[PDB]
Amino acid sequence: ASRAALIEEGQRIAEMLKSKIQGLLQQASKQAQDIQPAMQ
């Protein structure tokens, strides 16, 4: 059984996973915008 050790591992993974999703979100916006306006 794991009650305290399981929560500690999730806290460490959640902190790293949080930044991983942040970098992915910024890349997703660049793939949609690509700083290349067509009408302007």
Distances from the Cα of 23 to the Cα of 17, 20, 36, 39, angstroms: 10, 5, 21, 28
Elucidated via: NMR
Question: Class of the 1-40 domain?
Answer: special
Q: Where are the alpha helices (DSSP H) in the chain?
A: 4-33
Residue for token digits 């915008």? Answer: 33
User: Domain-by-domain residue ranges, the chain?
Assistant: 1-40
Token pair listed for 7: 């929560």
Q: Distance between CA atoms of 3 and 8, rounded to whole angstroms?
A: 9
- Exposure string of 8-21, with b = 16+ CB inside 10 Å and e = fewer, is eeeeeeeeeeeeee
